[PDB]
Amino acid sequence: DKEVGLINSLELYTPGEEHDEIRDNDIANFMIFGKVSDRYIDEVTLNDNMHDKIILREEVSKIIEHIETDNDILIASDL
């Protein structure tokens, strides 16, 4: 007996499959109301010249280098 089953309390994050046009409306909504879609992040996180749409944090590369060498992460910050 063997079965893959279903995962109930966790959801697998599937990356987007298309490019969405980004208007100033989306920038204003993201920077004011906090509204965003995962396609926005997938579009601006594929390249790295897009400094007119998201603040590129330097901790991302260090965190990725740390996780790729078998080490867990614990992020803590303010409000």
Next chain:
Amino acid sequence: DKEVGLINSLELYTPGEEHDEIRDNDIANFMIFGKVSDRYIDEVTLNDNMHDKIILREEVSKIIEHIETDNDILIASDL
């Protein structure tokens, strides 16, 4: 003995003659996100030709007419 004092559980409305400029972002924020200011409501009231910025119900006219004849109002609607 006489003293006007201060009113502590109610606030007094003050209109906004200063005509604030209106942009498309204010249209989007009001229609979608619910955020709006008092200057907006004062601006969309004085002139009745501003139909591309707010939906003008016909109930406000009847409520004003009912309150001008010393009748109190009760308004009930839904979510």
